[PDB]
């Protein structure tokens, strides 16, 4: 009588009630055992997320889960005989809620305003843009943002004047040849894509003022 942690993906579709694991007492070899569960998610708030089949030991999930609401549950299993006597010590039941990509990346600002001097060499840091994602960035790529430049306005002298660091969001000059009198302002369409570039995209603007030498 011991149970391994239970792993359940959030936003599940059951069908409900969904069997998770069967609790079983070795003492059932001689008498009939009755199972029960207690704890937050079972008999205490949020009540009824989990239930157990009294006569079989089957642990049940009663609804879809939300990792960003509750990521983990700690419950207790109890095994009693018909005489009301406990046949086992309480069993710790851990239920881990695994992540789904249910949040889109969000830029901290719609417009980011930065500046750089006209006589700068390639590799010079311009400004740092930021995007956040509520999903998990540790065990999954759901919370992992990948930064990119979609377009540059204007394309004078050429389209690829700037670069953005894929993970930091730091904008850098990649080509020399900037001039305030020629082009004083650049409107960079910048993107943040979750799942490290394979998920959803969000767009913001980086406005770069070219300062006179």
């Amino acid at each position, epitope marked *: 009588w011991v149970v391994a942690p239970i792993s359940v993906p959030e936003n599940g579709k059951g069908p*409900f*009630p969904q069997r998770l694991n069967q609790l079983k007492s070795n003492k059932d070899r001689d008498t009939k055992i009755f199972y029960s569960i207690t704890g937050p998610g079972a*008999d205490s*708030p*949020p*009540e*009824g997320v989990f*239930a157990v*089949e*009294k*006569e*079989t030991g089957w642990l*049940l999930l*009663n*609804k879809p889960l939300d990792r960003e609401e509750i990521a983990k549950y700690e419950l207790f299993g109890h095994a009693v005989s018909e005489n009301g006597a406990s046949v086992e010590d309480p069993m710790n039941i851990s239920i881990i809620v695994t992540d789904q990509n249910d949040h889109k990346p969000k830029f901290t600002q719609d417009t980011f305003r930065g500046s750089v001097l006209e006589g700068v060499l390639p590799g010079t840091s311009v400004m740092q843009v930021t995007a956040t994602d509520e999903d998990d960035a540790i065990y999954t790529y759901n919370g992992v943002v990948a930064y990119s430049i979609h377009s540059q306005e204007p394309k004078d002298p050429h389209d690829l004047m700037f670069t953005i660091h894929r993970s930091t969001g730091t904008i850098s000059v990649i080509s020399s040849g900037l001039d305030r009198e020629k082009v004083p302002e650049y409107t960079l369409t910048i993107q943040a894509t979750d799942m490290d570039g394979d998920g959803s995209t969000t767009t913001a603007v980086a406005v770069v003022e070219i300062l006179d030498a």
Partner: antibody
Amino acid sequence: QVQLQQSGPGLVKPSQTLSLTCAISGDSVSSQSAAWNWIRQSPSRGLEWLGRIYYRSKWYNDYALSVKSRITINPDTSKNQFSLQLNSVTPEDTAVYYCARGEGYGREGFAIWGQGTLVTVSS
Amino acid sequence: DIQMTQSPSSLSASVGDRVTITCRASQTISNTLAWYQQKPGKAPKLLIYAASNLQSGVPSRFSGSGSGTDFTLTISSLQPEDFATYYCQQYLSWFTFGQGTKVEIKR
């Protein structure tokens, strides 16, 4: 003893919102030993639990998956009542709506019920 | 969800008769079952909970039995005020109800 008194309009037009209230006497909507429910009854689908609210350290709610996208159950502690709000109604929402008290979290059945409010969804 | 199926849909009985109503759950619910009595124009009335526990103030002529998937409500001696529709309800996974058994007067 505990009494539940229902109020609210019966006639709701299709795609419009159904709004009902349940007034409590002899108990508190904020009771730490009760849960407040809405249950409907139609000749077609029978008795159907819609959702509950209950107060412990804070407010909690649970909605039937069938109505989750259209339903709201809210307490009004000052008036000692709780409401039912069901958006975008269709003739399938035609039923007698009941408010009910479940001792604890409802795991001992529903002992106290309101009188019922007939809701007709028609144009 | 768990579906509750009652049997028969209606039955006819006389005053003083022993009446037996059945309820079947689509999956094992052990003892998480309540019984209700409902009269026309009225809200349901709780008779039994935990399959066999008589609700306070309910006459002793009402009794519940069964476990797992199969349940019974018994009225040991049918009284004139007992002619009504009886509903079973599970509370293992949320709250679902049976379709009812109407107990009518035999003549």
